[PDB]
């Protein structure tokens with residue numbers, strides 16, 4: 320129940336990155352994938368006998384919506400003078416029925432994911448901006464546990480689905496601060512580890 324959902328959520332947070340220029344490093348990948356959400360980890364291939372990575376890496380995000388946006392955007396983009404391949408891990412299958420269940424459950428909500436939120440922007444002023452598409456039920460930015468500094472992303476929940484669709488359409492890649500917002504619909508319901516019979 321709650322255990323197999325956690326297993327799929329963990330796979331949903333990871334994105335495969337292939338065709339990485341041999342001279343490119345972990346920081347180049349970090350800067351490139353950080354706009355979609357804060358990076359939890361970068362697992363990179365290493366050929367001990369040949370030196371330098373084996374052209375691919377696994378970027379792990381904190382939330383599955385970040386991985387979905389980094390997949391939609393970022394695939395085929397040029398990095399270091401080589402077009403990268405962005406996909407999902409090979410074992411994403413035989414986990415897919417739960418990924419599809421989480422997607423069905425997400426459709427019951429009018430929740431959107433927002434990344435690349437400028438550090439100086441707060442909760443209420445992000446709420447005021449996105450309130451242009453309709454009445455907002457909740458608007459919350461993710462915070463750092465130590466300092467109350469937000470992590471550059473959050474979730475907005477709308478009363479109507481039209482508002483939700485309008486917001487993603489009109490606000491993805493919007494110039495708010497020096498940063499371009501990355502906005503997508505949620506791919507999970509709020510708190511996916513619930514399964515309430």
Ligand SMILES: [Cl-]
Pocket residue numbers: 494495496497
């Ligand atoms: Cl501006």
